[model samples]
Structure formats: structure tokens, C-alpha cells
Target: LTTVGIRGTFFDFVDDPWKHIGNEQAAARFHQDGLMVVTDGVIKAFGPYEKIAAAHPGVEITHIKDRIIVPGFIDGHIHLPQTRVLGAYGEQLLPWLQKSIYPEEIKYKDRNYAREGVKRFLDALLAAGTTTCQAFTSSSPVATEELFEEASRRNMRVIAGLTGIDRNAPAEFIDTPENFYRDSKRLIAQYHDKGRNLYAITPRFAFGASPELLKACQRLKHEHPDCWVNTHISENPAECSGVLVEHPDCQDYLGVYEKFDLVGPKFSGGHGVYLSNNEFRRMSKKGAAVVFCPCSNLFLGSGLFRLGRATDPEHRVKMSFGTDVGGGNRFSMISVLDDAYKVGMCNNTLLDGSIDPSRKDLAEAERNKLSPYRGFWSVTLGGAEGLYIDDKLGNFEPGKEADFVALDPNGGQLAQPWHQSLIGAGPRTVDEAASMLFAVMMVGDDRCVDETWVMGKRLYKKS
Candidate 1:
């Protein structure tokens, strides 16, 4: 199966784009690996091995045989400065921000700190197959520039800016509205929509941004219509209470950002665990997106994300997946999926509430199931559709960039029956392959990622 240029959806703007390829051979390889992408610096098409081979014979094809290929995962919510401090004693959301997060963020005041951390941060992301991301950067303008420069060097897509925390943060981690406005404007012109990257006006949260700073972010959004806006919302109780205390007139937490004109198609609010029906309706009406960082929610002891409600039939909220770094313990999206499963379990449903079906169950099942399919869509097309970058990046299609991952069964020491039972069917169907993927979601890691390709180029390989 070979997939040429074809439009498809994945988890985020630059998740996996090779899913829509209509070739059988390529599909087979993609199922085994992650996904295979071919490109000219932009997605071209994605599919199994033979299909892509047939489409472009003698076109310098770099076949990453023996790998698990999928679309590169997206870190929908992350912090650039906090890259090295992941899993470092994260308490609740508010305490974690002040203690574990802010202290490390203050280090960005040093140019060397920003420069060094950015490289390691991106390397970690790429290693996990996260090709694109949205991160809350440090307060210093130098740090944002450093992050942008580093992203450009690697040709990865990034959405980042200074974190806003005008009131509750330490002075070292503070940046005034004027500073944020001026720096964001300059960075937007220099980086937003530049090559593979897009500039996002980042407000750490209602707690982070003051009325003045948030308004400035609104002003920039208006100035640059194509740019994106990101912030946190309803992740923790203290954070919500703090917002109400600061803005008594505002109806609720969502109101603060809306009052600041930070709600729309370009807006993405992370971890909407406590959103009300009306608030969800309002966000849906405004065409805004909500990101689910289940790992972060769990790590910070935040509430489970109410997926079904927020995505109610009437005004559906565009939703996506992310690794809200540092706060999120695992770098692998597979682990994040596991977290999402647990969240679903807490919420429960007519079916078994657990996210991961038992390995024994998966082994016993004779056919594909619906739950894994739902999770698969959430991390793939579901994310791409949410970010509104679907046409170009998500699926494998003609004229689209091909970015994908490849998995390998024979790569590492850990060999189990699940591996055999999953991919062992030998060229599984999309549905069957998806079931095999669930085993990985609950268990696999780097050993599963054999090779990675971006824009028709090979980026990483695990012997």
C-alpha cells in the first residue's frame, strides 16, 4: 500500500500525516512501524512501504524497515524552560507551578540556561515522536528567541511565548504587560508562521497573566490574525478560586479569558477539567479548542477531563491531546494515552471505564474493538482536526508533507507474547493494527520506535 499526497487528520497540527495514504503495502509497513512519511520539506504522502515505493520509484526513498511508524506525536501543552525538571516532585497544580516550575523557569534569565535547555528539550520531544508542540516559555525575551532559534535549527514546529504570571509568581519569574506585549509582537513577526513554526501568544493561565498582560496578548492576536493563542483553564481548584478572587466581576474562570478576548478558533485552553456546560457551550460557540493533558492532570492531582460533556452534540469543543511536560511524567504519548484511559475510567461509561483493555483481553479478542479506536483517533486525526492544521500535516496525501514514525519488534531486549500476539498476525488490518497499538499504549516505549521520518527525510533510528 502506498499513500501519496492525501488529506488526513491526526492528534495535532503536526502529528502524523501519513495515515491517509491509500496503498496496501505502505499501510502494512505503517501498521508495523509507526507511520512512514515522504516529503519535500512538507508532507507529501504516507502509507505502507510498497505503495510509497511504487508512487515514487528511484526518488531517493529511505525505507526505515523494521520499525513502528506512526505520525509524530504532538506535545499540545508543554513548557520549554521546565523540560529538564519533569517528574521533579510535582504536587498540586498551584504548588507545582510555584515550587517545582517557577524556580526552574527563573533560570531562563541566564541566556546560557535557555540555550542549553532548549536543545535537550527538543531532542527529548523528537525522541518521543513529538514533531510539533505548544509550550509556555520563560519570561525573558531572550528565552523565547533562544527557543525559536533552536526550533529553527531542527526544523521542528513550535508554538511558544513568555509565560504570564503577573500576580502570584516570584519577582524573578515576572514580566510586566508592556514587556510581554513588546516581546511577543517582536517574536511573532520573527517566528510566528515562520517555516514549520507558528507563534502562539501564551498566557500561563489566569493566575499567570494579569488583566493588563492578557489584554496585551489579545491585542497581539488581533494584530496577527494567523497566530494562535494558548493558556490553561480549570485544571485545579485553587487556580480557579484564585482567578475568581482576582476578578470578582467575571462570571467564572472561562470568563476571564473571554473578557480578555482570548477565546476563538485560534485559542487553545489546556486541561478543561472543570468547565461548566454553559462555559463549554460558550467555548464551542466561539470555535475554540480544549486540550487534554491527562498525564499532567493526574500528576498535578487535578480532576479528570470531562470529554463526553465538553464534546456534547450541540456545540462541540474541538479537542486534542498533549504532554503538559514536567507536570506530565512521561515523554511518550503512549503513556499519555494510558493516562487518558484512566481518566475515562474515572468518568466511567456504559462500557468498562478503563482506558486500557486488559492485555489478556486483547490477547483473547478475535477481532478489533471500539474503545482503542477512539483513543487512536484522539491521538491521531482527532488532534490534527483540533489544531486546524489538518489539510497539510495530518494525513498521507498527494502534495502533503510526510512525517511518520516506525516501530520494530526485533529492536530491543523486551520480547513478549503481546508483541507477537499484536503485530504477529502479519500485516494486520487498520482495525487490528489499532488493537495491537493499544498494547503499546499501555506498555511500549522507545524500544517500540524503530525509525522516524519527517518531510520525506529520516530523522531518528533505534538500532
Candidate 2:
């Protein structure tokens, strides 16, 4: 991802936009960004355009004018069947499931519907410069098959699986625990390690999958440590209650998955709103990752996520962001960024509620400190680190895959003057001549996303 000539890695890409980790100041200010991904589909190197251009004499480059290149956005959780079903009514979590989520998911029973869904879903992501993702499909075996096939054909990086819902869902979408395991295993065998894709064992949540179904996931993880496990935990009060109802023997919702050995490095639990210190500490020590779907959390009346919990000095639970589309209201990470600002603001206010005698609320100060650059870093390096693929994908450096997007981050697209463009210019400054051809991320969109390259090949470009 390149913005204002500054380049970074394209971490785990998802089909939907995750939270904006930074604020407007960082978003508006950019540097000469560029990246080089190896021919073998790994990022080779990334850095300033001038620095790279000077080193490689004849290496050609395309500029994605009028846009900003950001690290490919990584979405930790999203349901494939719910791609276009966003903006459903604002009922609470439980009622929303039956009224909106369930009926729409049943459409995947048709193979044709699944294919079209993937097509539309992926197109939206690629256009947004998200090169990888972790997605969940409906119970239909055909739907899972279609997702894998489509991803493989496009050579896209996707971590996904069949949503294992053996009970409490529409009968048409239900599956036996045994078949769920069988199908998941089969899909993994077929799609895991196929290009830039990995198979994720998805249980939806406690309500969606029975205890038996979750155990199958544990078994799969035990067998394949490299694969990912995607599901939900502590999203809302009612949801937690439902988990207790489903697994009365388990001490807590997290225990339900833990009882079956489902807690580990590969676990990617979504929401995580009501996590206690113990839960957060355990996940940190165990290396399991938690995903924050801020927009969706606020949308469904779910509680605010304490960013401090995961970023705690002692626990340091690995964290990433997700759109949780359908549940999450927006399709663009840009919009997600707007929502994240609010989340940060809310967090600050709560933190301000309790303060030290010596210091003005640190939380409020931190919330005010939120920057666009910081937000970009969260979605880029933060997401990459969360997915455990940072060593290879989150930054611009040599020996990495040449997958990047071109966008000018200098407000130059609107024909603004050099003085205006330099209004918020930081320490590293660029001349008017250099800024004119630049793609400022300020007014960016697909039209601004000039060149979208994957593995050194041009997948999409605006002519």
C-alpha cells in the first residue's frame, strides 16, 4: 500500500473494511509510498518512490493518481452469505438474527447465488485495495466450495471456512455435527495452501454451533496448527447468555471453546466486547487473537471495546479489526475509519470518568491524540501483526511480494494550489511539481485507486 509516496505491507486482506486505526491528520498527510512484491507472490521491498526509483534503474512504475495507497485492509471476521445484506433493521442481536440474518443466509442454498455473492463481495474489496481477508460461508457445502474456487481462480489471499451451525438456525441451513466436521476437513484438504488462501474452521458462535460442532473445530486445529479458527465471543449480553444456555457445563463463553481445545494462536474470535481481564490475559498468553468490530458493536448496541485490554503491557493480546458486514453497516474502510474515531472518543470519555489527581484524563488525551496516520498503521501493520503474517506482508522492504496500490495523498486531485497542499505538510516535504502528479488519499475511492497490483501483475487499473 502506497500513500503520498510512503509504502507499507498489505497484511491479511478481508472482503470488508475494518476500523480506521488512525485519525484525519494522518490520513491527509502522506509521503512518497511504493512497494515491490516478489514474483513468487511475497513482498520483496517497500519504501519511498524516490528511494526505490533511484535504486532500480529500469523498473517501471505506474502511479495511482488521485488516491491514497493504504496497507491492504485486513478484515478479521465477515460472513460471505451476508455480503449485500448490510443495513438490516436495528433490532438487538438475538431478534436481528432470526428476522434478518437467518432468512438472508438461506439464499446460499443455491450454488449460483453463492458464486454471484463471492464475485460481488470480492470485487468490492479489491477495488478498495484489500488484498486478503478471513471470511465465513454458509452451511452449504457448495457455498464453501464456491468461495475456495473463486479465490483460487483469482489467486486472492483469503482465509475462510464453512460456518458450522448445527443448531438454533434455519433448518435448511443446519448440519449434523459429524457432517460439519467432515465437510470442514474436506474443504481444508481441497483449499488450504492453495495459493494465497488458508482454510478457517468457523463455528459462527455458541448459538450457531452446538458443543459437538465446536469440538470438530478443535480437532481440526489439533491436526492443522497452521489453519485459522474464526468465530464470535462476548459480542452482546444476550449472546453471552445464549452461549451459557448452549453449554451449561462450561464456566463461561470462552470456556465453551476452551473445553474443546479451541483456544490458541490460530483462533480469531470476533466482537470480544465483554472480555474480562482473565479472558484477555489468557488469550494474550496463549497467543489467540481478538477482533474488534467497532462499527458493528455500536450498531447492534453492543458495548464499546476497551482497546486497552488487548494492548495491555502484560497481556498484549494480539488484535485486528473486522467489518462484520451486514452486522457492520459500512462497506468502505474509509467509512469504518469515521466510526472508529467515535469509538475512540467514547472510550476516552469513559476513561475520563475516572482520573488521577495529577494527570488530566489520559484517556481523553489519547482520544484526542488519534491521528489518521495512526489509524492507517492499525489497519496495516496492526492487522498484519494480528494475523501473524507481518514478517512478510505489512511493510515495504526488499524480498517481499510486489503487491500495492497507487494513490496520491496530497489534496492535489481537486486542483488545489501548492500552498493549500502544504497546509498540513509535515517534516518531509514535497515540491509542487512532485505533488501535482501525486495521488492524495484525501479524496480517494476506486477512481482514485489508480493501479491495483497483486504479485507484480496488474489486476485492476484506471486507464
Candidate 3:
């Protein structure tokens, strides 16, 4: 009972495919007939089924032949309070925040409602096969507490903190600088690094935080070096201009966070859709990460992200995929990647369309096309490495946690009867495997999910 073994098609990464674009094999590990042994929720051994079975004699193995098992997903930037507002009739960034998000988040102050909301959100995430996330909460510490409690009960890996917004939002939803620091510090002491829970010093954004509030955040960073700082940057032109106006002394949107000493490896900004070359270079140098929310960006009419430039080896910035629920419209990682594929196409249109090749300068463009392998990595190890949690999760290594999903390749029959993804009459070749993942990301949904597991325990299985 302390150990279990599963045999199926498992996929994971040994390196970053984004780092070496044309060389996906350099970063990939694919086993059509693989075996993973889990002892006390940790991976004990994993490799070819024949070799592993012989090595660990008599260990009962669960053979799931018609499924693709990969590492559980990691969501880098999401709002725990925006659980119900997904697919809201969203417009531009600032307008959507006021109209769709703020009104809904303000309801989190009610304890009963917040708990119910948080539970639903976590369950939905599990059903969609996302086992880890760095999330945001309403300004209410009450809402944050509920999220931490629910996530802990499910044993999901999560990071969050009380949002600090001393201005812009309704008075009831706002917390002063002093209160923000004290409350966040208290929450950190109470929940951070506790089991699967972690805390982030969450400032809503530049416009949401006053100069004093931002300074207070800087002080918190000095005091508690372990906690993370999460915020938004360069999501929209209007929002970017709005932030620049708020802090005229700073040259750009990211500079505001930089000036307050809030830019570093521990910092994760929600959207860098509009950051310039200099800003990208500085963020790369600082080791700060950017979360690309494809659905939200496209829905909110935000500019396309320069993924090629951001992941360029010359000045690569750590990057992750975010559902950005409410604004994002879906919790499915499949939807997120499909949108990312489209966003890359949109960027390519602007560059490749130019009559003169020299006229196109997409902020030191590399390749605007986002490969299917790259998108899969973004939701798995890529997101994990960017969030600095790959040591424990994100891949099927010998010593990591056994968090993974079993997806039915034929489950998409109702949606796409023509193509069967992640299955074969025999074992698939490496290129066929890559092509199958592309099909799933484009056409798969929760239907593709056969089961979701956390720590070697099956938490969700489709009927």
C-alpha cells in the first residue's frame, strides 16, 4: 500500500525546449512503454517498463495503455477571487478590471461566500489537471485565508497573499500601506511555506498601489527575503500609460517596480505584453519572470507578447503560462496554449507582412512562431522552472513528487472525430509524439483528461 507503479505513455522534459528551438529532442523525454514507481508519494524509479519491472520484481503495476501521462500543470498568475468572473464580457485592461473584476472581488469579504468560491475554484483547477499555481486574492485577508485552507485540504501546491491596493478600487476593498504590510506579514507567518502553501506579496498593480504602499512592499521584501512579489505590468497601452503617469519619475511601467526595489528573481509580473527591448533586457538581468496570459490578452485586446524575444537565449527572461481566469475565459491549459499559438501567429503577421524585411523590428524579434513543444513546456516544467519549484514537481524524475495526469487521446471524438491524439496501433515515434501533443493543445479540453493525480493519489477521474 505504500508504493504503486503505473505503466503508460509518459512525457517530461530534461531541459528547456525554448532554449534550443530546433532541438526539441535536446529537452524532451518520451517513453511510449514507460513505468513509474511511487513510494510514499515520491517517485522511486522510472524508465522503460521492461527494465523497471525486472528491477522491481513483484511490484503490481497499473497498466493504462490508452493514455498520455505527463507532469501536472502549473499556473503562474491567476486570481483566486476571479473564479466566477471567467468569460466575463471583458474589454481593455483598465475597463475590464473596473467593470468585471473589482465588483466580483469585493464580495470576498463575506467569509461564507469566499470559502464556497475558493473551494469551487480549486476543484475546477483539479478537474482541468492543474496541480500547482501562484495565485492572487482579493484585498481581503479573509479571502486569502479561505484559498490557503481549501488548497491545503486538496494538497495542491499554491502561492498567494492578501492583495495590497490602497487606492483606485472601492474604499471597502482598499487596505492602507501600514495595514497591508501587517496583514501580509501575519499571513506569511500563518500560512507561508506551510505544507503545499506559499505566500506572495501581491500588489494589484502600479495604479492600484500608492507610492507609500509600494514603499511598504519594499520594506516587506527587506524584512522577509523568502516571500515572493506578484504584480501586473505592460498589459495594455492605456494601462501602461496610466502607470507611467502615476510614477512620472520612473521611465516605464517596470521601472516603477524597479525603483521600489521590487524587481528580482522572486518577482513575477502578470503580463509583459508591451515591455520594450530595454525593459525586457533589464527584467532578464534581474531574473524576474513574466506570465503570458494568452486568452486574457486576446480577449482584452492587449498587444501580442514577444515570446521569441523573451525566451531568446541572448537575453532570455524566465516565462510561464497563466490562465488569468475571469479575464482569461477558461481554466483549461489546452485553451491557454491554443491561444498562445494564435498570439504567436498574430505577432508573425505584423512582422512577416512587411514589404521590406528591414522595416520589421519586433523588439529584437527571434521567431514569432511558438512551437507546440514550447507551449507544452510552458504549462509543465517551463512554468515550474520559472516559478522556481522544479526541485519538487514538474517532471517525472527519480526523486520528485508523483503529480501527473492521464489523458485519453480518443476522448476528443465529439469535438474532433477526424484525429486521434496521443494513441497509436503501435508505439509512436518522437515526431509523432510531438505532433500528438499539438493536436491536444489545439483541440483537447477537460474531455481529454482521464484522471488527475497528486502525490501518486488519484484525485479526479472522469466518468
Candidate 4:
């Protein structure tokens, strides 16, 4: 139980001399036959199987062949109580909430429903190879606590919060300023940073929260400066317009959150589909992140996310991929990558009327497109950096916790042909490996995930 070693083909984005180098360069490190030595749930050493196994001769080694070991996928944004609302069809953001999301969220008021949904949600995430996430719960504190408790019991790393929504939602799903603060405070005391659970301060979104509730959230943030603040911004044009109407004095949607002291390093807003250059500059200045939820954007007709603009070197605000389940239409982050690639491929095209004509330079655009390694980093190390949890859980680096997932190339429908080619070619260079990774991202889903391990223990395995 104290010491264990896992041997396999390993790939991870690490921090070293290669740090800051683009993935196309020397950032991504791969060991064809690698060994990771774990002691008491922490990584003790990692290198070639021949070398490390000789050093740690007595360690219990688990040799898993034909599977790739990589850092466990981290979901930067998702809603827990919205588990039952996936695949609600033919509606945009505001209307989708009314028809599909809110009604389902109302059921969280019944703890039994919340309990069952939370169980299903966490199990699905683990089976999809996600070992950590920053999640939003319903406005009900009891429902949020159920989510946290279940994740704790399962020993999954989760940052969650009781959503603050005093306006625009159904009465049952609303939380007043006083009650929101009191309940959030209780949950913070009970769970924040205790074991693997961290509490986030959540205000459903600009449109969902009133000024009073947002101010209370700002206060909660200041009281616990280390905690994260999760909310949505500029996901839809209508939502942006509503925010400007609600706070006329502020310049834009992000300005409203800034007025309440909510834009900072510990803060991340979901979607950001309609952010302007000025908004991106401000977000970068505050060290805030735009939690990119590609599948949700496409599924809900939110518009194509400008992955290029958000990650431009000049105003590179931190970035991470979010499943954004319920609205996202899929529980698998690997499937989320498929949508992300499609979104990136269609960047600034006229697929949606929201594209800026000035940003359509074809030559410049080609250089700025998302690549396989960049996408991989976003889910692993990039997300860890965005959520401020990189120190403990991003890569297979020594001293980090032993959280990783084993993926079989032959598991899913899309992966079958690609896996055959990869095995035949025998990837030896980074470009070849990148090509294989791309194929997996494009075609793989939950079936591709063979096992998910957290702290050196197997949490889930596919049959």
C-alpha cells in the first residue's frame, strides 16, 4: 500500500528547461517504455522502465502493456446538478435554461435526486478519465454539500460551490444574499482545502445573480482569498446585452464582475464566446482564465469560440477546456476535444454572424491554429495552472501526487483504424506521436479510457 510502480508507455507535459517551449518544440516528453515509481501516493521517480525498475527493485510494479499512461484529465468547468439535462435539444442559451436546465435543477431541492445525480455524475467523469474538476452545483446548499461529500468519499479532487442566484431563475433555485453567504460560509468551513475538496465561490452568472448576491460573493472571495470564484461571462450576445443593461455604468460584461472585485487570478468564467480585445486585455491583466467550453458552445448554438484570439501571445489569458456538461451534450473530455478541433478549424469563419471581419487574415490565421499538443496541455498542465493546483497534480513529475489514467488505443470506434496505423508505424518522433494523439482526440470517447488512477489507487476501470 505504501509503495508501488506502474510501467507503461508514458506521455506528460512537464515543467523544466522545456517549460515555456511550445508543444511543437520540446515541451511534450514521451517515454516509449516508461516506469513511474510511487510511494505513499506520491510520485517518487519516473524514467525508463529499465533504469527506474532497477533502482526501486523491491517496489510492487504493475506492468500494463499496450496502454498509454498520462496525467489524469482535469475539467476546469462543469455543473454537477445538471447531469440529467444532457442532450436537451433545439434551444439556445436563455431558452435552453427555461425549457431544459432550470426545471431539472429544481429537482436538486430533493436531496435524494441530488444524491443520485451526483453519484452518476462523478462515476461518469471518472470513467471518462477525469480525476479532478471545478464544478458548479445548484443554489441549494444541501445539494452542493451532497456533491462535495460524495467526491470526498470517493477521494476525487473537486472544487465546488453553492451557486448564488437571487434573480432570473425559478424561486426554488434562488438564493438571497444573506442566506447565500451563510450557507457558503458553512460549506467553506466544512470542506474547503480539507483533504482533496476545495470550495469555489459561485455566482451562477451575471444574468442569474443580482447586484446584492454578487457583492456577497465578492465579500466571500476576500474573506477566503485562496478559494476560487466560478461564474459565466459573454457566452451569448443576449446575456452580454442583459449584463450591460443591468449595470449601465460598467463598460462591458466583464466590467460588471470587475466592479464587484471578482476578476483575478483565482477567478475563471465559462464560455467567453463573445469577449472583445479590450475584455481579453483586462482579463489577462487580472490573471483570470476563460474556461473554454467548446461542445457546450456548439451544442447550445452559443457560437464558435475564438481559440486563437484568446491565446494570442500579447493577451494570453490562461485557458482550459471544460466539459460544461448538460449544455455540453457529452460527459467525455476526449469528445470535447473533437469539438474543440472543429471550433478551432472554423475560427473566424462566417459559420456564425459574430465573426469580426478584421480578424480573418488567412496567412496570420494559419500560424495561430490549435495543435494536438496544445490541446493536450490545456486538459492537463494548462488546466492545473489555471486552477492554481499545478503544484500537486498536473504531471508525473517527482513529488506530485500519483494521479493518472491509462488509455487503450483500440477501445473506441474512432480509435480503431488510427490505432492500427500507429502500431504499424511505431511512433519514434514527437511529430509522429502528435499525429497519434490527434487521432485519439478526434475519434476516442469513454471507451478509450482503460483505467483511472488517483493517488496510486485504481478508482475506475472499463470492462
- Which candidate gets the maximum TM-score versus the true structure? 3
Candidate 2, residue 26: lDDT:
27
lDDT of each: 0.69, 0.67, 0.84, 0.84
Span of 10 residues, lowest total lDDT, candidate 4: 16-25
- Please give the RMSD to the true structure for each candidate, in Å: 6.3, 5.8, 1.9, 2.7
For model 2, residues 1-463, the per-residue Cα lDDT tens digits are: 4322223322222221123233223223235344342435555435556676676555445454334454566666777888878888769788998889888788888989989998888877777666777888888788788888887777877888888887777787788889888888888898888777888888888877777788888888888888888889999998888778878898777888888888888788888888888998989988889988877988888978777556655567787777788888866554455566567667676666455444445633464333444455556667777877665565455554445665434332355435435545422332332233222322333344555666656677655
User: For residues 279-346, what per-residue lDDT tens digits would candidate 4 score against the true structure?
Assistant: 99999999999899999999988998777677766777787789999889888778888898888778
In model 3, the runs with Cα more than 4 Å from the true position are 353-356, 361-366, 413-417, 421-427
Q: Write down the TM-score of every candidate.
A: 0.85, 0.83, 0.96, 0.94
For model 4, the stretches where C-alpha displacement exceeds 4 angstroms are 15-25, 348-358, 362-364, 422-426
The list of candidate 2 runs beyond 4 A from truth reads 1-41, 48-51, 65-67, 354-369, 408-450
**Global local distance difference test of model 1:** 0.69
Per residue, candidate 3 scores C-alpha lDDT tens digits across 51-118 of 99999998879887778898998998888889998877737878888788888999999999999999
What candidate 1 gets wrong by more than 4 Å, as runs, is 1-39, 45-55, 349-370, 409-419, 422-425
Ranking by lDDT: 3, 4, 1, 2
Assess candidate 3 and give its TM-score to the true structure: 0.96
* True lDDT of residue 349, candidate 2: 61
